[PDB]
Amino acid sequence: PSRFTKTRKHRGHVSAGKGRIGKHRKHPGGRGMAGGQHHHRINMDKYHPGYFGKVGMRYFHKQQAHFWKPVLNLDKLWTLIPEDKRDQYLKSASKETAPVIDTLAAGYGKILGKGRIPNVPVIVKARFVSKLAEEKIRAAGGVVELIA
Amino acid sequence: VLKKNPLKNKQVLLRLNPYAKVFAAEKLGSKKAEKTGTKPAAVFTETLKHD
Amino acid sequence: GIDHTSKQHKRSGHRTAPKSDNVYLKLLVKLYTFLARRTDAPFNKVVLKALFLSKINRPPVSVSRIARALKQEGAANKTVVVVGTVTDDARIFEFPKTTVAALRFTAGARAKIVKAGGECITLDQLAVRAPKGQNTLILRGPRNSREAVRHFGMGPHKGKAPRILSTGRKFERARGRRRSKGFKV
Amino acid sequence: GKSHGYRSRTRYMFQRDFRKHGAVHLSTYLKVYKVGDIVDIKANGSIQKGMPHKFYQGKTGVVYNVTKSSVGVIINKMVGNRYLEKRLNLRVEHIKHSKCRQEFLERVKANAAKRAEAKAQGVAVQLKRQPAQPRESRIVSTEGNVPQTLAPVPYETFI
Amino acid sequence: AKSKNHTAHNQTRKAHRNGIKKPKTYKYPSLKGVDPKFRRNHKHALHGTAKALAAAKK
Amino acid sequence: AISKNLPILKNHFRKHWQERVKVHFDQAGKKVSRRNARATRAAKIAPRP
RNA sequence: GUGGCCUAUCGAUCCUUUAGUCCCUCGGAAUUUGAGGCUAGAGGUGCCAGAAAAGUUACCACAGGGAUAACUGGCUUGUG
RNA sequence: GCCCUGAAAAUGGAUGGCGCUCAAGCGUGUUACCUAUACUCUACCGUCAGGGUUUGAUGCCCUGACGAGUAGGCAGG
RNA sequence: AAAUAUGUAAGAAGUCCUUGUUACUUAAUUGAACGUGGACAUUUGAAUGAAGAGCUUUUAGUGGGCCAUUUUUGGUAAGCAGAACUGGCGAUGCGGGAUGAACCGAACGUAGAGUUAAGGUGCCGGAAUACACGCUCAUCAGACACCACAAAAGGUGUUAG
RNA sequence: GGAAUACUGCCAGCUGGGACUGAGGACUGCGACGUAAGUCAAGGAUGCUGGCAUAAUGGUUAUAUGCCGCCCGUCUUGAAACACGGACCAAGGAGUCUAACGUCUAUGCGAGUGUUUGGGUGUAAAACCCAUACGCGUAAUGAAAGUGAACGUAGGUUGGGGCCUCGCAAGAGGUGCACAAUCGACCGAUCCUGAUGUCUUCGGAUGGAUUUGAGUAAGAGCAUAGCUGUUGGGACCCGAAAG
RNA sequence: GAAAUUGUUGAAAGGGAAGGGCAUUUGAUCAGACA
Ligand SMILES: CN[C@@H]1[C@@H](O)[C@@H](O[C@@H]2[C@@H](O)[C@H](O[C@H]3O[C@H]([C@@H](C)O)[C@@H](O)[C@H](O)[C@H]3N)[C@@H](N)C[C@H]2N)OC[C@]1(C)O
Ligand SMILES: CN[C@@H]1[C@@H](O)[C@@H](O[C@@H]2[C@@H](O)[C@H](O[C@H]3O[C@H]([C@@H](C)O)[C@@H](O)[C@H](O)[C@H]3N)[C@@H](N)C[C@H]2N)OC[C@]1(C)O
Ligand SMILES: [Mg+2]
Ligand SMILES: [Mg+2]
Ligand SMILES: [Mg+2]
Ligand SMILES: [Mg+2]
Ligand SMILES: [Mg+2]
Ligand SMILES: [Mg+2]
Ligand SMILES: [Mg+2]
Ligand SMILES: [Mg+2]
Ligand SMILES: [Mg+2]
Ligand SMILES: [Mg+2]
Ligand SMILES: [Mg+2]
Ligand SMILES: [Mg+2]
Ligand SMILES: [Mg+2]
Ligand SMILES: [Mg+2]
Ligand SMILES: [Mg+2]
Ligand SMILES: [Mg+2]
Ligand SMILES: [Mg+2]
Ligand SMILES: [Mg+2]
Ligand SMILES: [Mg+2]
Ligand SMILES: [Mg+2]
Ligand SMILES: [Mg+2]
Ligand SMILES: [Mg+2]
Ligand SMILES: [Mg+2]
Ligand SMILES: [Mg+2]
Ligand SMILES: [Mg+2]
Ligand SMILES: [Mg+2]
Ligand SMILES: [Mg+2]
Ligand SMILES: [Mg+2]
Ligand SMILES: [Mg+2]
Ligand SMILES: [Mg+2]
Ligand SMILES: [Mg+2]
Ligand SMILES: [Mg+2]
Ligand SMILES: [Mg+2]
Ligand SMILES: [Mg+2]
Ligand SMILES: [Mg+2]
Ligand SMILES: [Mg+2]
Ligand SMILES: [Mg+2]
Ligand SMILES: [Mg+2]
Ligand SMILES: [Mg+2]
Ligand SMILES: [Mg+2]
Ligand SMILES: [Mg+2]
Ligand SMILES: [Mg+2]
Ligand SMILES: [Mg+2]
Ligand SMILES: [Mg+2]
Ligand SMILES: [Mg+2]
Ligand SMILES: [Mg+2]
Ligand SMILES: [Mg+2]
Ligand SMILES: [Mg+2]
Ligand SMILES: [Mg+2]
Ligand SMILES: [Mg+2]
Ligand SMILES: [Mg+2]
Ligand SMILES: [Mg+2]
Ligand SMILES: [Mg+2]
Ligand SMILES: [Mg+2]
Ligand SMILES: [Mg+2]
Ligand SMILES: [Mg+2]
Ligand SMILES: [Mg+2]
Ligand SMILES: [Mg+2]
Ligand SMILES: [Mg+2]
Ligand SMILES: [Mg+2]
Ligand SMILES: [Mg+2]
Ligand SMILES: [Mg+2]
Ligand SMILES: [Mg+2]
Ligand SMILES: [Mg+2]
Ligand SMILES: [Mg+2]
Ligand SMILES: [Mg+2]
Ligand SMILES: [Mg+2]
Ligand SMILES: [Mg+2]
Ligand SMILES: [Mg+2]
Ligand SMILES: [Mg+2]
Ligand SMILES: [Mg+2]
Ligand SMILES: [Mg+2]
Ligand SMILES: [Mg+2]
Ligand SMILES: [Mg+2]
Ligand SMILES: [Mg+2]
Ligand SMILES: [Mg+2]
Ligand SMILES: [Mg+2]
Ligand SMILES: [Mg+2]
Ligand SMILES: [Mg+2]
Ligand SMILES: [Mg+2]
Ligand SMILES: [Mg+2]
Ligand SMILES: [Mg+2]
Ligand SMILES: [Mg+2]
């Protein structure tokens, strides 16, 4: 609100906190990004290393669909099972029955390896995995089924 | 709540330093000294009065 | 007049009370200010202060950090104290029992502490059971974990990350970021 | 146009010390510098490689690195309102062990002694250092020395 | 229009506000710049003695 | 017009952008009106769903 | 022994052009041309942190400046 | 050493003015005295701080120190 | 070869014994670097000071300065031009310099009493037309830092050498 | 030879005159005088008397008198200035709003979080409810194809608040979060190493490297709001010669 | 029915402006208090 604002406080001091010498004028720098390459280079270098020019390959008509590949670590992976059913599959580690986790269902495109999932085997249906993910799954007795 | 000075106001001069009682009672400000008669070497009064 | 050795009329620059208007919070202050003065117990004075800290200085203590804290030698049977809110961590499968005195609890942490047979205590209950704060454990959340302190001290060859909206190639990766264009940082 | 090149103004600083020019006596190359030693930095104009910059002449520092010909030294240089840590690569021609620490260690060794020597005697040590203390009372003798009286002298020209 | 050129006037006073803070010493200083060969051994030299205080409690 | 450490913004009001501003002050008014237009079909439409 | 005994002898982004692996992409799929990329140098900015640039206004104009010239005054006093 | 001479400028004029000549001048010595928003002591105001104290507890109470300010910042109003 | 200014040191992150690790290094289990373990105490290592110390973010104004003593460049000089250290003025009143941005004094909440500073005490004007030894008589006397100027050269004026 | 006195200093020696101040408001402290009971000038004024009880004190006001006081605003090293604006009065008269954002702080919830496009509903622009999606987090590094976070109690070491143990205490040991410093480890880029194997050129295991990243290493976010700050907009208000 | 500004009445002061600060006298005018 206006009533809290410093500009109320500046009522009665001439310059409005703007200064008596250097005043407050229209555009002492130039407008916007003007002179990144000249007077403003000291700010533009540091604070924005990398601004000017180009770097590698263009792409004509890119579409981020094809790139949809959400990532889920074995940090979690067990979050895809609701918690009643979950402790149920936790105890009784066995093949012949093991939980079926369809990750592409859960919104994901790849399984990463973050770490430490229980000794409990799981069948993880997935689109892609890391070599380290799919290893740890196999160190709990589980496997990986590629799906689409 | 008010600083009072010793050196006047006996009461507090006697609050600190009760040896105050003794000093005043025995004088000692005014203590005489032991008169001795020792005289300076005639070398001294030569070089004192010398040119 | 006076040659002045240090700045005059210097506010001590320590929060005297919370900036918060929460009544209950203020009461916890009222409690611990009493405890702090009379108890002579260190643990109290600390918690008084930490009751002042802003959101920034009350980082969420994750339930798993509490797990790890208790695995300390002889530290299993202490009661962990968090001035701040405590958070549910999916990433532990096992969890210990104990007792957690905390200003706030998120839904899961409470569910996760109780389900394992532990107890979610409000701080004044901790004052009742622990007046001098005996057999207590204090755990601070990570402060510099925050995403703002990413950008602090951004400079050439500080590798400090820039303030920027859209990221990728095309975005502050060219001049001065690579020896092939200008210099590198 | 104004000039500052690396060696500017160093004319008399790097100059070779009268009757002391020429190749460098071998004890210089003999001394062994272990990391953490306290070094004095003095350039030797005959040795152009591994040469300190003119700022660091007179400076004292400590050696963080030991390579073939050269001890890397850190110096705290003041710039602006702070000091930055600076790292110099110097050939040992330009370096010498600093004797600042000399009395220290000698006092350290001295202190441990006076400690076990007085303690194994039943303590009463007082091993800290004291500034010069005002003189004590003394008698002085006039025997064979009578005061010889003195007068200021009248003006004379003699040129 | 000709103007002043340079001076160090007052520039000292301004430093001694925030006062010329001292160099900031630390124990365990940085190995940045140390002889790379000396580090590549020093690595395997600590690695051993860590494994040797690990069999000391065993 | 460049200072401090601030992300470079891009905020594209260089045209007379105040000439095209739609506030939807009808957000309520339309939500009513297209309910009333739904009632008018469901009756005019006979039991059809 | 990592050019000239030391203290000087030099040059961004865009662009073109070469060197390098024979590596990455031209997005329906391939092969073969052609095109793009990364790493590294050159083509040059000398106003040397780096615009693409001729004059006249005795017909003139605006913003300003005593931050600055033409005169009185003030310091100076070589010169007179 | 003091004094004289060297010593010419324009409105009428300035040891600040009057005036002063064993000074009210010059050199030097000794006292006494006069009086700054400074120094000391006390009252009051504010600010900062360190304590005390569960019924204005955002409170009350004790104690000490400090107080110049354009551009400017923050604060309570 | 000074003076003034200048680098580092004055300890627990210290000193000493013992003997581990390695792909470095030595003829060499040599040495290097980091170490396990053990010993050494208080007066933890000169003075002085300290209410404190360390640390982080963010942002205003500003980015024409000027002056004084000393150092110092150009210039015949300049209230000129231009550097060095510091203190100032600017941004600051108060007492003194009659007056005056920068000199002296001293810096500022409202008051009281005391005492002072710099400067003064014939009268204007608060305060000795005080005391004391001298010098000085000007038909242009002289009279107080910064400061509002004077010189070479002369006097058988008088004074003391 | 014996004194005196000056001079300098000391006294917890005694005492006259004058000025200003009287903060505080039961008691509590340090003491002091007393054989004592008591008393006191001992942690801040009380006792005695008189006048008036009213414009007498005082407030306000005009004025006279002593001393002091130059026009404000502004730009400026410097302004009372022979610098500019201002004859007078009233009423207007200038850092806003919006989009996108930085730091801080409050709040709701939290590995997630954002009802308000829209739908349901209403006492009808309000309040109340909600399905899927989306946005932003939870993975990074590469120009890219693409690869993608535990040797170990998520590591070693130094300091760490708090807590634990011993001790009456002084002290000693234990554990040690945030944070700080350092030595390692893990992911991607870069350079090398190239096992088992096989379309004979695919495959890239294993071990490395003064190289590098806005990474990992028991999550800190997302959303509302406020101050201050940014940029674009008529962008604090008024002003061109032009086009 | 404000201000600038103006008439008349009342009061006051005024030797080349007026206005201000400290302080008191004097004129005028008033609150409070006490009982
Ligand atoms: C400060 N006021 C001054 C006033 O004092 C005077 O200025 C003098 C001027 O007279 C002096 O100058 C003059 O007078 C002096 C002598 C009197 O010192 C002579 O030496 C000099 O040759 C002459 N020009 C000059 N040296 C300093 C200024 N302040 O005249 C000018 C003025 C502005 O009125
Ligand atoms: C009420 N108006 C004023 C009034 O105040 C009074 O003015 C005096 C004035 O006369 C005094 O007197 C002074 O002023 C006058 C005036 C004519 O300039 C001078 O002639 C006189 O020399 C001077 N002493 C002056 N010292 C203070 C004012 N209060 O005199 C009448 C008036 C000027 O009209
Ligand atoms: Mg202005
Ligand atoms: Mg401002
Ligand atoms: Mg500006
Ligand atoms: Mg340019
Ligand atoms: Mg930078
Ligand atoms: Mg670009
Ligand atoms: Mg990617
Ligand atoms: Mg598919
Ligand atoms: Mg003061
Ligand atoms: Mg101040
Ligand atoms: Mg030169
Ligand atoms: Mg020499
Ligand atoms: Mg060379
Ligand atoms: Mg210019
Ligand atoms: Mg000039
Ligand atoms: Mg300049
Ligand atoms: Mg220049
Ligand atoms: Mg319609
Ligand atoms: Mg070689
Ligand atoms: Mg070379
Ligand atoms: Mg040669
Ligand atoms: Mg080039
Ligand atoms: Mg295509
Ligand atoms: Mg293709
Ligand atoms: Mg240029
Ligand atoms: Mg240039
Ligand atoms: Mg033209
Ligand atoms: Mg013509
Ligand atoms: Mg003509
Ligand atoms: Mg014509
Ligand atoms: Mg001029
Ligand atoms: Mg002239
Ligand atoms: Mg001349
Ligand atoms: Mg002249
Ligand atoms: Mg003369
Ligand atoms: Mg005269
Ligand atoms: Mg006089
Ligand atoms: Mg005299
Ligand atoms: Mg006298
Ligand atoms: Mg307080
Ligand atoms: Mg308090
Ligand atoms: Mg102030
Ligand atoms: Mg201001
Ligand atoms: Mg020490
Ligand atoms: Mg040890
Ligand atoms: Mg100027
Ligand atoms: Mg300017
Ligand atoms: Mg001048
Ligand atoms: Mg000048
Ligand atoms: Mg000058
Ligand atoms: Mg200015
Ligand atoms: Mg001022
Ligand atoms: Mg001043
Ligand atoms: Mg004055
Ligand atoms: Mg003055
Ligand atoms: Mg006073
Ligand atoms: Mg006084
Ligand atoms: Mg007069
Ligand atoms: Mg008088
Ligand atoms: Mg006389
Ligand atoms: Mg006399
Ligand atoms: Mg004068
Ligand atoms: Mg005497
Ligand atoms: Mg009283
Ligand atoms: Mg009586
Ligand atoms: Mg009466
Ligand atoms: Mg009266
Ligand atoms: Mg009056
Ligand atoms: Mg008046
Ligand atoms: Mg005056
Ligand atoms: Mg102006
Ligand atoms: Mg000017
Ligand atoms: Mg002015
Ligand atoms: Mg003028
Ligand atoms: Mg002007
Ligand atoms: Mg103008
Ligand atoms: Mg004017
Ligand atoms: Mg006007
Ligand atoms: Mg006008
Ligand atoms: Mg979501
Ligand atoms: Mg530790
Ligand atoms: Mg400690
Ligand atoms: Mg291959």
Ligand SMILES: [Mg+2]
């Ligand atoms: Mg405008």
Ligand SMILES: [Mg+2]
């Ligand atoms: Mg804006």
Ligand SMILES: [Mg+2]
């Ligand atoms: Mg216009």
Ligand SMILES: [Mg+2]
């Ligand atoms: Mg037009």
Ligand SMILES: [Mg+2]
């Ligand atoms: Mg045009």
Ligand SMILES: [Mg+2]
């Ligand atoms: Mg009127």
Ligand SMILES: [Mg+2]
């Ligand atoms: Mg007249």
Ligand SMILES: [Mg+2]
């Ligand atoms: Mg006047």
Ligand SMILES: [Mg+2]
């Ligand atoms: Mg007239």
Ligand SMILES: [Mg+2]
């Ligand atoms: Mg008056």
